[PDB]
Amino acid sequence: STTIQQNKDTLSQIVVFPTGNYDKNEANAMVNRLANIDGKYLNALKQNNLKIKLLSGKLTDEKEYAYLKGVVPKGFEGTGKTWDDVPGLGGSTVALRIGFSNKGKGHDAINLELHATAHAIDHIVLNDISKSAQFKQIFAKEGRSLGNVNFLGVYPEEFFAESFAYYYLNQDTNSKLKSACPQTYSFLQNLAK
């Protein structure tokens, strides 16, 4: 409980809410789900001045992502979709559409904000650990055990991000990950030590 509050406090210096009208209750719910992330990662994001930008509109309507208009994201070949239609982005920045957290809301991630923030943690905090030799070996074995195998089984950075999301969303997804991907589960456990 005290740790939950600390993580929410840290997130108050990371999360940026949009200007104008937006769903305040859902944005709060999204912050609450992010507070389940281990505090070590959240503190590292804050220290790196990583902002989690919540959006009330399309990602590409933000000045800094306008360059992605019409661009097909990695792994989205054949979907008929471009960044204009994608509700979240993670990496050197994080941007998320409010209301699109759940699987099937324009994406098939277990949770939008956790998956996108995992990309930022991978890249900014852990220096692209998902491309390390260690994780590539884990990914070679377990990367096709969580579904969407033409995406999660092909890009180790996506397998990492989604496994991270399973680990931190709730107790049920945490248990599912341990059953399906035990070496990934232990890897993430040891990462958080």
Binding site: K74, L89, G90, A109, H115, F151, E158
Partner: peptide, 7 residues
């Protein structure tokens, strides 16, 4: 770096 969610 930019990465999308699962399609």
């Amino acid at each position: 770096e930019v990465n999308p969610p699962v399609p």
